[PDB]
């Protein structure tokens, strides 16, 4: 709500998501709007994949998804935030889950940090982050 929307721009490594002996394969990315990330960071992969709302309950505000092709750069997904949104959760459904960072939680700013809007009323109100789906997992870019 303040700011009102968000977006994530995704790059995927050319070698992302290639099993032993197999070619790199598109990977499913989910983006979840969250009231809190506690249940999200604790839930097991299957639970989140098969029924996120059940395992997350009231903590899940919204969710969206897309596929990312190995080597693809600058693929953007965004949506509207909500007043009580505190985190964006990101899940990457790697075929070989072991040792991969297949989930990340990104904290949204709190009241303090978006204070500038009452005075700077016309500043852009879309938060943007950049994520890479890498061979070892998801990581934000500096």
Residue numbers in the entry: 32 to 173
What's in the article?
Lip is a membrane-bound lipoprotein and a core component of the type VI secretion system found in Gram-negative bacteria. Genetic studies indicate that in S. marcescens this lipoprotein (SmLip) makes an essential contribution to the basic function of the T6SS and to T6SS-dependent antibacterial killing activity. The protein fold is dominated by an eight-stranded β-sandwich and identifies SmLip as a new member of the transthyretin family of proteins. The pro­pensity to self-associate using parts of the SmLip structure that will be exposed in the periplasm suggests that this protein, exploiting the lipid anchor, helps to bind and position different components of the secretion apparatus at the outer mem­brane.
The structure of a Lip construct (residues 29–176) from Serratia marcescens (SmLip) has been determined at 1.92 Å resolution. The structure is that of the globular domain lacking only the lipoprotein signal peptide and the lipidated N-terminus of the mature protein. We now report the high-resolution structure of SmLip determined following phase determination using single-wavelength anomalous dispersion (SAD) measurements based on the scattering properties of iodide ions. The refinement proceeded with the release of NCS restraints and the incorporation of water molecules, an Na+ ion, ethylene glycol and a number of side chains with dual rotamer conformations. This data set was derived from crystals grown in the presence of chloride instead of iodide. However, we did not assign any chloride ions to the structure, noting that typical water molecules occupy the previously identified iodide-binding sites. Molecule A consists of residues 32–173; molecule B of residues 33–142 and 147–176; molecule C of residues 34–50, 53–143 and 147–175; and molecule D of residues 33–50 and 55–175. The asymmetric unit of SmLip is a tetramer with 222 symmetry, but the assembly is distinct from that previously noted for the transthyretin protein family. The accessible surface area (ASA) of the SmLip polypeptide averages out at approximately 8350 Å2; the range is from 8200 Å2 for molecule D to 8510 Å2 for molecule A. Each molecule in the asymmetric unit interacts with two of the other three and two types of protein–protein interface are formed between molecules A–B and C–D (interface I) and between molecules A–C and B–D (interface II). The type II interface covers about 6.5% of the ASA of a molecule, a level typical of the values observed simply owing to molecular packing in a crystal lattice. This interface is formed by the antiparallel alignment of two β4 strands.
